[PDB]
């Protein structure tokens, strides 16, 4: 090559393509979690609305990176989007616990990409990550920790009244 | 010094400086209690907002006295602001119980200063205290008593659902 | 540990606790400077309002760091807040000169914390500092330099008319 | 008363009549000071407007006491209103210095009346004084101290530019 490409390393380009896939995959997990709470034998409508919004967010995270790639003169190479690992997610608390784990995993990936940009001396990539992904990631993780703590102290998942009230008063 | 000083006793002046410190210290305690409820392993956001507001109030109580001192022609002498005694505050109820104790202690100090003003025949200081601090203090203590009673009757602190609901329905 | 803690070093955590104290201390200095200009034998009301606002700013700087600590999964450990070093601040110019010195000292601390974050490879902490503290610090220092220059060229502190006019036309 | 008189002592009544005279007299002093600054060989129009407003205030202070007297069932006995002691007031600073002295003298009178009410066990008179006169008096004295300090530090009265600027920037 592009007439526009400048100080953009191959390794950086490839790592962007992997991140794009990870984010797409995270969107998928969340999509799954959402319609799980919409089942008639589950029926926690605010849980459902919470993971649907999360699902849309993650999609937007990917499309931003797709945009960054073209901007720097790289080429987008897409891969399959894997099946979320679970079909059944058991309870409200369990689902929150799996989302916390998911987000911590996305942050390592992002911490690794940032260390690579640094090594390649790509200050434009470093700030992009720092500015649009890292602060969003710590605020996400703190929020899911808050949620898990509350559910747990209320007595979930053994208490059905506890997930019902949390759905109403916190997620509502 | 002062060209303005009139019927203002040394002892009164010194006692004002001590009160200023006590109020500053109370602000500090409350500041501590607030970020304790903002921890991910605690997470009671309305508890947090309640002690943060309390923290700001106390700061305003000090600055008012700083203002009274200059007005009467005294001189402000500041001292260190001590570490709150606790780092961990254990539960919602415990924290409310410590705040009740704190406020009762601030009121004795104020009752003692008022008795001193009386002894020194300083009617201007007497009304100032009576008007800006004593009624605010009894309304504060009654309110924390109300809170402690409710938390206790709901079954706190052994009940996590109890502090969760109180945070939502009373402090919210 | 916290379920939320990730790539957050002990040393980083401890350094945050020290910064929190420094900022609290800066708030205290400024609080002192303010009621010094409110004395009947000083009486420069805009000087007073200027350091009171500065005082509130610094408090907000601390509370932000308190927030960052919880967010990253660290624990807040508070220490005593030391007596400002001066009780009397002599003149308008002197007070501005002491504030310039204070701010330069806060910036070194912040430059040192940033170098530590870098060493520990904590890109999230690096941007936080860079984004909320370093640019605010250089704009603060430049502004106090401007003020000191003007006071000095007007003929302060030997000229009382000079501090009176500056209070009116610049700080007003 | 009188069918209305209750727990109102003779001595209290008489002391009210004296206070009424003192306030009337203070109004007169201020009236004099005002037209002194309106002279073509003086001409400090904001000085003039400041003592005219002060003059009206003092008149209102008297009329309030006249009202208190009737309310308690006492009888108003009026006396002559003495000539202010000065015809010429020399300068801006001098006039402010004489007003400070005047106000300190009015406050002693009020402190003495309050001690009398206390001795006679007249809680209604005590609060009346405390509430409508003592806090107004300390705020008055502090303000005139501020003014005297500023005039003095600017170099008045030897500096004509100093009183001119003060009239413009502070009293304006
Ligand atoms: Ca597959
Ligand atoms: Ca200590
Ligand atoms: Ca009273
Ligand atoms: Ca010390
Ligand atoms: Ca006569
Ligand atoms: Fe994402
Ligand atoms: Fe208080
Ligand atoms: Fe600061
Ligand atoms: Fe009066």
Curated annotation (Swiss-Prot), chains A, B, C, D:
The keyword Cytoplasm applies. One of its GO terms (cellular component) is tertiary granule lumen. Its EC number is 1.16.3.1. Its main location: cytoplasm. It is found in: Cytoplasm; Lysosome; Cytoplasmic vesicle, Autophagosome. Expressed in the liver. Keywords: Acetylation, Cytoplasm, Cytoplasmic vesicle, Iron, Iron storage, Lysosome, Metal-binding, Neurodegeneration, Oxidoreductase, Phosphoprotein. It comes from the Eukaryota. It holds the Pfam family Ferritin. Residues 6-155 form the Ferritin-like diiron domain. Oligomer of 24 subunits. There are two types of subunits: L (light) chain and H (heavy) chain. The major chain can be light or heavy, depending on the species and tissue type. In the human liver, the heavy chain is predominant. The functional molecule forms a roughly spherical shell with a diameter of 12 nm and contains a central cavity into which the insoluble mineral iron core is deposited. Interacts with NCOA4; NCOA4 promotes targeting of the iron-binding ferritin complex to autolysosomes following starvation or iron depletion. This is Ferritin heavy chain. It comes from Homo sapiens (Human).
């Amino acid at each position: 090559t592009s007439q526009v490409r400048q100080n953009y390393h191959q390794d950086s380009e490839a790592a962007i393509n992997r991140q794009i896939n990870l984010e797409l995959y995270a969107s998928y997990v969340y999509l799954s979690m959402s319609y799980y709470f919409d089942r008639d034998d589950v029926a926690l409508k605010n849980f459902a609305k919470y993971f649907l919004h999360q699902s849309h967010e993650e999609r937007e995270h990917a499309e931003k990176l797709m945009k960054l790639q073209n901007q720097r003169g790289g080429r987008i190479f897409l891969q399959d989007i894997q099946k979320p690992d679970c079909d059944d997610w058991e309870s409200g608390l369990n689902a929150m616990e799996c989302a916390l784990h998911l987000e911590k995993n996305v942050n390592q990936s992002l911490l690794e990409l940032h260390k690579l940009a640094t090594d390649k001396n790509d200050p434009h990539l470093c700030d992009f990550i720092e500015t649009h992904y890292l602060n969003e990631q710590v605020k996400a993780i703190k929020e899911l920790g808050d949620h898990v703590t509350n559910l747990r102290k209320m007595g979930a998942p053994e208490s059905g009244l506890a997930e019902y009230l949390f759905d109403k008063h916190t997620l509502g």
